[PDB]
Design a protein around this ligand. Sequence first.
Ligand SMILES: NC(=O)c1ccc[n+]([C@@H]2O[C@H](COP(=O)([O-])OP(=O)(O)OC[C@H]3O[C@@H](n4cnc5c(N)ncnc54)[C@H](OP(=O)(O)O)[C@@H]3O)[C@@H](O)[C@H]2O)c1
Ligand SMILES: NC(=O)c1ccc[n+]([C@@H]2O[C@H](COP(=O)([O-])OP(=O)(O)OC[C@H]3O[C@@H](n4cnc5c(N)ncnc54)[C@H](O)[C@@H]3O)[C@@H](O)[C@H]2O)c1
Ligand SMILES: NC(=O)c1ccc[n+]([C@@H]2O[C@H](COP(=O)([O-])OP(=O)(O)OC[C@H]3O[C@@H](n4cnc5c(N)ncnc54)[C@H](O)[C@@H]3O)[C@@H](O)[C@H]2O)c1
Lengths: 318, 318
Amino acid sequence: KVLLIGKMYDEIGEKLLAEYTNVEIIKEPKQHQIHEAIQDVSGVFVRYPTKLDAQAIGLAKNLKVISTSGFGTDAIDIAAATKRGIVVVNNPGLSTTAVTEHTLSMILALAKKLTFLNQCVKAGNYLIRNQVQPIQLEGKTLGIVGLGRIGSAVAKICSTALQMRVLAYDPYVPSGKADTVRATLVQDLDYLLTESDFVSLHPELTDETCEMFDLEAFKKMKPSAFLINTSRGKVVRQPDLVTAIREKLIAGAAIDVFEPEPPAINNPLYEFDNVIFSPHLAGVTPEAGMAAALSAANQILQVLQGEKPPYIINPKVW
Amino acid sequence: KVLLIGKMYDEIGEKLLAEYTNVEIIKEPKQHQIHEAIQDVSGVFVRYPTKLDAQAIGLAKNLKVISTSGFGTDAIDIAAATKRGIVVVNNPGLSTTAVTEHTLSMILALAKKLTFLNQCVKAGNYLIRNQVQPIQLEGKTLGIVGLGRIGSAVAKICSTALQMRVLAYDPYVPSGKADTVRATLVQDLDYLLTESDFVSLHPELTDETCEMFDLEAFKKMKPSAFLINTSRGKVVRQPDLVTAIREKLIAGAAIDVFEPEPPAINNPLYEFDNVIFSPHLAGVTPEAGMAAALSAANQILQVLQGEKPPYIINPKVW
Ligand SMILES: NC(=O)c1ccc[n+]([C@@H]2O[C@H](COP(=O)([O-])OP(=O)(O)OC[C@H]3O[C@@H](n4cnc5c(N)ncnc54)[C@H](OP(=O)(O)O)[C@@H]3O)[C@@H](O)[C@H]2O)c1
Ligand SMILES: NC(=O)c1ccc[n+]([C@@H]2O[C@H](COP(=O)([O-])OP(=O)(O)OC[C@H]3O[C@@H](n4cnc5c(N)ncnc54)[C@H](O)[C@@H]3O)[C@@H](O)[C@H]2O)c1
Ligand SMILES: NC(=O)c1ccc[n+]([C@@H]2O[C@H](COP(=O)([O-])OP(=O)(O)OC[C@H]3O[C@@H](n4cnc5c(N)ncnc54)[C@H](O)[C@@H]3O)[C@@H](O)[C@H]2O)c1
């Protein structure tokens, strides 16, 4: 028996679990409903941000595997599952391709001033073509902050396909990793800031990267340069971005993540024609949802068959 | 002596002509000004769309070479120059990279619904994220019509970097040209129409391609597919594109070129949130202007030194 605490991101994951297990789905999970349905199941799927505490894990007698819906596992009492022999697996990185494409879309849209030119045409101001000139990406410098799953994939596209010079700042990756995607790893972040025509943020949100892009960073950036953020809103100190755009410390920005989130209806960034937005959708494609559903459903079956899943969070239990 | 009827797009072409010839530049060219400055010069550069008619060509006693600023030569009386032994050259293909990047920008913008999502957020409708789902390009099929300079460069990027299956339709290109850019050349346009998730137009405008994309073509396209046109406005019958969008025969369109051009304030396409525009700027970058200026200046010098230029429009005079 397998319990789905919340629906999966795609129905393909629920059908696959139904092929091998008896699956019960709680659509709107309450804490008492979990207690009454977890006692005899062998696997548990947890939809973010529903919590799974020591009480529910204590009531789960036959539990062997707990799977979250994505990267986040903060809502799961990991300590309670390790003592009971339960392996816990998450499902990270399954929207790497979606965010990569979304990042490329925003870099290009800023270079071609797409939203502004589209609005000008729709208002009958086709003649804006005489004043405004797009930017050619070939030969420009892309600065990547965070050379992880997405950062590496974005680096690889822009360096080879778009023929950009790619700098990368990431102190926790092997020194040769930038060469695998034809980027140059730099040790000093200030160097990336003064050399880049486009800066794209893809770091993990840590205490070191939190508000890493503040006013001091924007001053070092080229006034003609653009900022792209598809990582986390807290990586950018948003008031400093508002100042950077208004005082023309940079030429524009593309933003998929916000702090605070959701953004308020009257966010001061909304008034600028050189700032473009998407409502935290960079990783949301049908394919990414299916991959997350399949990865979660399949790791449950691996544990129930004695096979080692690839994303164990508590390795000391295997 | 060389006369510049209008400024070149970049000063680099004017300096190169000044190294070998005596150059006069008429910045805002009037017809009588052309008459009074062309009588003794050996070469002429014509900035679009200024006309060079039989009266001016008749007054040009020492004329040997006429160069336009771009592809177009409609404003030049070619017949009057052919009789006088004057070679005419255009300057095509010097913005291949700009149009390629602009094409990619529009393909991505449609897939991510960028302008619509940007408008919703700025209008306080951040919650549109619950209604709208972006498209992932990886694994989709791109159909390229016209596998020339632009079509080939778009094919190569989309097939490898973006991991798309690329089909091409071009009956005048060697069968192996598609393989060099990892595309499949198909003989039946219907095959490309029914198989593509994105159709991007890059053909030369001929009587065969004029209004090639009419209502019959849009009916064969997938209701989920998108159209991108950066080639020429006459390749698409615009009323049929309006019908195709309104009746949802296709899912959206990105348009950089228009028929008629310029588009009017009340274009019926403006009302649709899934149609995006740019005001015929796909090829307009500083780099493209520099290359066009260099090519025009160099073809003038080639003729003045007896060397055959690569883009002669009237070859029967050589
Ligand atoms: N890189 C650049 O080319 C560049 C640089 C700076 C500025 N611009 C902007 O572009 C505008 C004109 O650029 P351009 O004239 O030098 O480029 P062009 O290639 O000569 O384009 C001239 C026009 O003629 C038509 N055309 C295209 N191919 C043609 C062909 N083989 N034969 C006949 N007509 C053809 C097109 O309009 P239709 O389809 O409607 O007939 C095109 O817009 C200027 O107003 C300027 O604002 C361009
Ligand atoms: N819908 C969306 O917008 C969306 C979707 C998925 C992921 N994300 C976010 O995108 C970002 C990248 O995702 P990922 O899968 O590539 O993560 P990842 O774990 O694969 O890589 C993150 C990188 O950050 C690097 N890093 C750590 N500290 C750094 C520092 N001080 N400076 C620079 N780099 C540092 C790490 O070395 C690591 O390589 C994450 O913040 C993730 O939450 C957003
Ligand atoms: N600012 C702009 O939007 C801009 C800039 C430059 C060029 N263009 C336009 O882009 C288009 C392509 O430019 P290019 O430099 O690659 O031209 P190109 O001459 O290199 O290639 C055009 C292709 O069209 C193909 N073709 C001819 N007839 C066809 C048919 N019936 N079906 C399918 N294909 C056919 C030809 O075989 C050729 O290969 C041209 O229409 C050009 O005028 C637009």
